[PDB]
Symmetry: C5
Subunit: 310 residues, 5 copies
């Protein structure tokens, strides 16, 4: 029969969420319960009830008695796994409890930056069996799988946690078992409002205020300054994101703001050219419409963003 | 009975306090004293009184004689533990003295940046038992636990050190012992006064001085320059902090200064617009109130900061 | 006879494509099938049909029975190979199935940045035999070699995948077998259009608009600003590329734009000098030709780029 | 008796001096000479006179014959020690020559940046005994300890080298031996004069030249530019130093220059305000005193720096 | 007699040349041929002619039969050696062929930046014997030492390759053999002309053009802008080089350009001061000489650079 093996995984400390490379590094604890009748021994009172083994001697022993063992292979591993503790307790009934406390990095294909930064993300850890379902099978421990009390992260909040089992057909032609610990996560919006959004509002309001200065050269100079500012903020945002292949919300916001500020520059230049022709009346009439439409233009852009991306 | 095991830990050199990732890396020394009657031997004069073992042979031996051993698992470990020395001295009475000199990084969930940079922090190292309290128990060595003579750090000053034992219920259903070495720490304020605060005072004083220049265009230009400066300082502060989720004191200071400088820009623009209407008397009357209230506004902000955050 | 050895390699997750150092890091899975008659055993019902071994014990065993084994040496390895899992299944017929799941970085000599960023690239992994073809030989597994369902990369798209075998004469005087997994790749153009091309168009259009301002000092100032902007964008592009030895397309675009903007600066200066001589008619006549030719100059440059680099 | 053990250490290549984290990484060679009578063997002609061992087999052997061995523990180790070669030659007389060629990073608590960059520094490597002086003792090899022919460093010059032995009471209650290799080092001043000092002199001289421009608005603008420049240089210097807790010489120089430039800005603004009142005579009289005192102010600052910091 | 040992080393892929830390990382292959009569065995037909061993078992065997072995110690190793493959083939005649395929970083003391960037560099790998020449000696393999077909580097071109043997007296009092693989290298000049030299020429030509603007305030402003530009380029060059202790060619070029631009600023200021006195004739006469001498000054500087540094 296919012997049933119990799995319990626990992400204790999420040490980082590096979105640039699309990975997250965590400290995890893995527990495996496996009842193998052959490993049962004969013990006397006074002797220990449950033996303790380190990994190397345990595997050499199982090589001596010629017994298959499950091959817990991490599907989403990244970089080098850092085994910290690996202990095995062997019971008289023939049950091995395997503890592996580790830290490692895992990739998460499902970043959908279509709603950055408001987007909710979905991280997941996979534990597949190298040997197929015909030999072994993976169950779930009752009250041990999940997350911990203190995650030690500020930028990300865990909303929901889940665990289950599924079947794959990757390494062997037969079916194999994969234990999945899958948790959603959110982003705290305090940063982006504090040190991105507010400066943009301040600079855009200064740009709007500069419209009615008259003597249309200070207007051009201030507009050039604002161009510098948004280009710097584009640089910061560019650093903070990966080499994304489809237009994101914040990227669209910034490119639209670039286009609008350039339109402001060109508009003041055209008004200056008209004033060069001397037709002051045309400029005087157009200024009112321009200043009335500019914030209206921004609100129209906000409405079209909210409609299109939601 | 639950055999009593003595623990002594010593952080010799704190190699770094990386707040961006919320961790601190230290060089530590661990000592374990464990009296196991079975390990006692029979020795003759001429033979060594206390044997010496390296870790691998020691564990293989304990696997040969089938004795449980404590599993010192670091709860706050981060990255990979770097074992440097691991020696064991075995005495005739049956006492093993285990030395483990190491260096590693540990996470500290309790950063409360609500009082940055004045805030006091609390770092702590945890040594839990994988096996429950029913088998083993952790005591404290008398005069060995604590810190060292020379820490080799400048940015942080250790104020108080403490050590104790506590019980957890994480890895097993039973109770288990955790030895905790917990030390508070402070920040030296010399930096932030030297190369953050003073430049801000200089630039804000220049901004205030620019109020009474008359011919309100140099005022606008200087205000734009000051905007550039505070945006650069916002960039520096943004780099120096993690992706914090609740508004910090320095962040509030800088965002308020942004708002005030933008208000200055808008005020000079509005005065220019009023002068365009020709009502020089209104601008002349308003300038006195503006220049009188501006430093008063800054002092009011300082008072509200001191009240609200303390 | 030269025993036939089957190879199957699978790049599951491409963790990065670092073009600055000219390498790409991937998570890979390797499978080796090798039928060795000597390793066949004699088994009884009840005993396992196929034994399982870890690498260390397996190699010690093959050293005990004195059998050669293939030496899968990676030709393009870079940095340190990170063995994650290494298992061997030994069958009664005398067939070893060797699994090696790993992650590592590989160099790719064939980056031809002559068409950056539109250029298509060609990555490849090589598995050579340390022992010559006279002893062993490498075949290809039927339906296992290739790539996976989810690559977890956004900036690069795999267009075509291929696998084959070839002969080399590097390590030994005799012929040896190399298994090659070679895949082409493309670049997503969304970034460079979003946050490089559009800002350049905006700034160049502002530069063109500045031509007809009259009172040729604002022209000089705006041209200097544009010079600053293109120098910043040159800095960004310089960071994003390796220390390339032959002029790339984007580099040529930027250097040409530098030359054109400098020509604009010099032209406005020369017009100012002519106006100093008072010959306003010459400047008035030359301005029309300059503004008519400037965008024409840019289109001529675009045409010569498209012709020369394609 | 306490057996005498000879130590010889040699820093061959100093690979880096990272002052930001207060450490320096070096490639070192360690030699230990230890005469143990028990290890003596009985050999025949034809057999090797001095046996050679690798570390693992040697330690297993000493575990078989039950002999204590010295525990060379590095006190200033940092990060992970990288053993490259570890050989032991065993002589018929009973002398082991242990070679350990390594590379590793060591911390240096004694950086006194009070005289940056002119300050001389003092690096040191410590080799302590885990076992106390009652058992073993550390001597010094005659002509092997010291530095090498080619250090391969440019920024730092070794002035003096020294070696000795001392006693500590850290790991055990008894006395223990520490071998110390301590070398002073200097800094080459070519950089800071080339690419820090000269630009500061150029910009400060431009600031002084700007004093007598008349029409006090270009003065204000140039002063603002100079403010930008010194803020950029403050950024560079800030990057180049650690989070130092007591004011350094270069930091004081830069903060004083900030204060003086801000005073220049305020002075030109006050002169502009006085000119607004029309009292041109007061400004004309004050300009001479200001321009006469400004370089005098800088020389007074230089004199007070030289006096106070020396 | 001193047994002759053959060495063949091959740098297959030069993965990086990091001049900032003065090192270069390469992927290398090492081959050792050593004829030891004792290791010869007695074999029968059917048995393998040449045995194959991994490093650990081989060294344990040589420890069992008590035979010295050469200790290939890398003199220029840096960081941690990363053994990738280590195989040994043992022949019936008594010859061991040792293969070690690796990747590692090596330091190169001989960077002479006196001719940066035109300077030619000289990299070299050293393989010394820990045991002296009295026991072993190092020969050179005939047609295996050297470099490979594809180096996979763009910024550096290998001009000449050489190999030889020499004697040292470092680790032991006796003479010892060092095998040296030494190759010169060059720099591709395409970068520095493309994205350093041309922008400098453009900005310096703009500075020269600004001389004859009249109304000497735009001259001062443009000169300040040029000062900003060269300071930025000084920052870039400063990043790209190590903390060099003797003035380099590019550093001298940039510092001279700083001095000349500052002289331009001061000259325009002095002309403005003379115009303040009203003596327009003196300024008109001096402008011609200044504009005639400025490019002449640059050519004189180029000539003195070419003479002094060559």
């Amino acid at each position: 029969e296919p012997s049933d093996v119990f799995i319990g995984l626990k992400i204790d400390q999420i040490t980082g969420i590096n979105q640039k490379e699309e990975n997250f590094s965590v400290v995890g604890s893995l527990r495996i319960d496996w009842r193998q009748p052959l490993l049962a021994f004969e013990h006397a009172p006074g002797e220990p009830k449950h033996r303790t083994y380190t990994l190397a001697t345990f595997l050499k022993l199982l090589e001596e008695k010629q017994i298959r063992w499950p091959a817990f292979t991490y599907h989403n591993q990244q970089g080098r796994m850092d085994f910290q503790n690996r202990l095995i307790s062997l019971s008289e009934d023939g049950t091995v409890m395997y503890l592996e406390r580790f830290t490692s990095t895992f990739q998460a294909p499902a970043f959908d930056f279509r709603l950055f930064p408001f987007d909710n993300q979905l991280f997941f850890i996979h534990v597949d069996s190298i040997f197929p379902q015909h030999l072994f099978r993976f169950q779930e421990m009752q009250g041990f799988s999940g997350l911990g009390d203190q995650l030690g992260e500020e930028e990300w909040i865990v909303t929901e946690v889940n665990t289950h089992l599924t079947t794959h057909n990757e390494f062997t032609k037969g079916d194999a078992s994969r234990f999945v610990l899958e948790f959603h996560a959110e982003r705290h919006l305090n940063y982006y409002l504090m040190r991105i959004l507010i400066p943009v509002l301040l600079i855009i309001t200064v740009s709007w205020f500069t419209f009615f200065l008259q003597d249309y050269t200070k207007r051009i100079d201030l507009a050039g300054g604002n161009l510098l500012l948004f280009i710097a903020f584009n640089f910061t945002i560019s650093s903070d994101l990966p080499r994304l292949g489809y237009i994101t919300l914040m990227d669209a916001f910034l490119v639209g703001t670039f286009i609008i500020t350039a339109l402001v520059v060109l508009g003041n230049v055209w008004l200056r050219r008209l004033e060069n022709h001397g037709k002051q009346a045309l400029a005087r009439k157009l200024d009112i419409y321009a200043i009335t439409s500019y914030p209206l233009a921004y609100l129209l852009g906000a409405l079209t963003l909210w409609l299109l991306f939601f």
